[PDB]
Design an enzyme around this catalytic site. Sequence first.
Site, PDB file in Angstrom:
ATOM      1  N   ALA A 152       0.824  -1.208   0.000  1.00 47.96           N
ATOM      2  CA  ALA A 152       0.000   0.000   0.000  1.00 47.96           C
ATOM      3  C   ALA A 152       0.861   1.262   0.000  1.00 47.96           C
ATOM      4  CB  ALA A 152      -0.943  -0.005   1.194  1.00 47.96           C
ATOM      5  N   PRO A 153       0.394   2.334  -0.675  1.00 52.51           N
ATOM      6  CA  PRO A 153      -0.900   2.483  -1.360  1.00 52.51           C
ATOM      7  C   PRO A 153      -1.012   1.810  -2.739  1.00 52.51           C
ATOM      8  CG  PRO A 153       0.366   4.478  -1.613  1.00 52.51           C
ATOM      9  CD  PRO A 153       1.167   3.590  -0.699  1.00 52.51           C
ATOM     10  N   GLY A 154       0.016   1.093  -3.176  1.00 51.11           N
ATOM     11  CA  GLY A 154      -0.106   0.276  -4.374  1.00 51.11           C
ATOM     12  C   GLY A 154       0.568   0.827  -5.614  1.00 51.11           C
ATOM     13  N   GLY A 155       1.516   1.738  -5.416  1.00 56.57           N
ATOM     14  CA  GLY A 155       2.296   2.284  -6.511  1.00 56.57           C
ATOM     15  C   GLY A 155       2.980   1.210  -7.335  1.00 56.57           C
ATOM     16  N   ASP A 202       9.257  -3.760  -1.032  1.00 57.60           N
ATOM     17  CA  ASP A 202       9.485  -2.326  -0.973  1.00 57.60           C
ATOM     18  C   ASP A 202       9.292  -1.932   0.482  1.00 57.60           C
ATOM     19  OD1 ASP A 202       9.968   0.304  -1.893  1.00 57.60           O
ATOM     20  OD2 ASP A 202       7.806   0.669  -2.054  1.00 57.60           O
ATOM     21  N   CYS A 259      13.487   3.656   0.141  1.00 54.65           N
ATOM     22  CA  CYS A 259      13.712   5.066  -0.155  1.00 54.65           C
ATOM     23  C   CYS A 259      14.578   5.686   0.934  1.00 54.65           C
ATOM     24  CB  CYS A 259      12.380   5.818  -0.287  1.00 54.65           C
ATOM     25  SG  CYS A 259      11.340   5.820   1.201  1.00 54.65           S
TER      26      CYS A 259
END
Length: 384
Positions: free
Chosen positions: A207-210, A273, A323
């Site tokens: 989530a949010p599902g990028g 991620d 990130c």
Amino acid sequence: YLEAFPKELREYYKNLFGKEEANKIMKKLREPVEHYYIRVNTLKISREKLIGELKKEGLKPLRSPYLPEGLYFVREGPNFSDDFEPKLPVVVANKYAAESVYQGAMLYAPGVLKADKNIKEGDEVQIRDPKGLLVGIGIARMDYKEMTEATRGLAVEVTLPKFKLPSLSELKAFEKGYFYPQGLPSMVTARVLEPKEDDVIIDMAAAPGGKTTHIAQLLENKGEIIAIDKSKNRLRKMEENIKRLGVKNVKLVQMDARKLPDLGIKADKILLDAPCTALGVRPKLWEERTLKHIEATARYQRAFIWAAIKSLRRGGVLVYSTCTLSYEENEGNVKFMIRKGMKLEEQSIFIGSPGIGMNKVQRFYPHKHLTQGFFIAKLRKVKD
Ligand SMILES: Nc1ncnc2c1ncn2[C@@H]1O[C@H](CSCC[C@H](N)C(=O)O)[C@@H](O)[C@H]1O
């Protein structure tokens, strides 16, 4: 700009990158990305068609020669000097409002923390964050009284933001699901995974599902993607994103991803991620996370990684991304994977930098690549 970063982190960066590079990274981290990327949702529209739509709205999208689904907008600014002292009454925006104004958003009333009492509609004002950072200049559309009381509405029309990035959220093109704002490194991540319609695929922090929806369009809505997240709200946002983008490819499951092997699934492809200290995200007005957070979060990520490794078929592929800039959460955690029967593999797209003392992983730096700080590792499970 150094003030935005706590001293021990600054020393950490200097130690890890060298003084010069550390200073260049921190300087750029304080600013929005120079190239603002979006993903073309090829489930609904082609790249050139979307460009036509964006040009209609007065936008100047540019094409990426590396990602056929990539478009970016060039950033505007800085529109004033770092030492600029406008002779203007002050509006203080809260932490969240200030960061958006910093990038060209208007200032709305709930975004207002406090203000100079002399302010009336039509007055020229300067906007500062709660710590005195000048983020923009504009024209008040409310008097002092209404500005500090209203629950909605426009408080300051920001005619001179420090930086300007296009606002795309209100476009018809956005509403019709034609694109999804997403950084270049994040897009490379899904590509480097090389998902196949046959693959059993798991996004364990989705989530949010990028990255999940990017996989879905690469699959052309075929196959199935299992998307995991612990947060119900972020999953709720992900549901909306899926519907808007026309994604029919994804199965949402709410759960602690660290317990992933509790399912009976042995995946061919896993994307991790991972939750991280986010040291690479831009813009960085004030960095709050520090060394204690790096160690704790790195340790937290190992639980995910181990869970992923155990849930991967032999011959299976794991893509790990963050990130963040830290060694421990990145190269350090890849060494962990190498000790657990995983092997480094060449990534299909490599336009970033090499990792720290490490060959096949891919790093992104703000001063070198005009992106957020980022990290990508691609691994093959050779044994259990
Ligand atoms: N213990 C846990 N189990 C499962 N998900 C977790 C978790 N701890 C944090 N997370 C989730 O990990 C996510 C990291 S942000 C990931 C963003 C996503 N990959 C994208 O491209 O849009 C957050 O949404 C958070 O909800």
